[PDB]
Amino acid sequence: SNKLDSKVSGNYNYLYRLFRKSNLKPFERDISTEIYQAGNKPCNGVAG
Amino acid sequence: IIRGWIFGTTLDSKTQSLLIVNNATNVVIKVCEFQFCNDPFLD
Amino acid sequence: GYFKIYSKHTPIDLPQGFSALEPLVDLPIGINITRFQTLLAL
């Protein structure tokens, strides 16, 4: 349904994940917001 | 004396947790992020 | 992605004997469990 689930402004409701630490096991859910440590040292809860 | 168990990973509101409790008349099963302190207990 | 519970009761250092356990209820739980804690009322 291209027309019935869209608008000129758009839909910001749907959320997906760009990247994550590890794969998800079958039939498992995770809503944690922890950022994977791509840098050499952790950032301790601030988006750096 | 002993009745019920709690399950989870962090055992707090941060992540999901399980809680099963008996109180001598029925069984309550519930999967919610309830607030568990250092050692929960009942009076 | 489930949760199964078995129970058994017997009157009267675990005792010397053989006994079997029957199911009670199966639960669809989508969160993995790694740690568990017991509760006792004083």
Ligand SMILES: *[C@@H]1O[C@H](CO)[C@@H](O)[C@H](O)[C@H]1NC(C)=O
């Ligand atoms: C599932 O298991 C992984 C590794 O054991 C752990 O990091 C993760 O926190 C668990 N899931 C939940 C929802 O706690």
Ligand SMILES: *[C@@H]1O[C@H](CO)[C@@H](O)[C@H](O)[C@H]1NC(C)=O
């Ligand atoms: C105690 O048992 C009653 C059943 O009469 C139940 O409704 C109640 O939820 C139980 N208490 C807790 C903390 O679950």
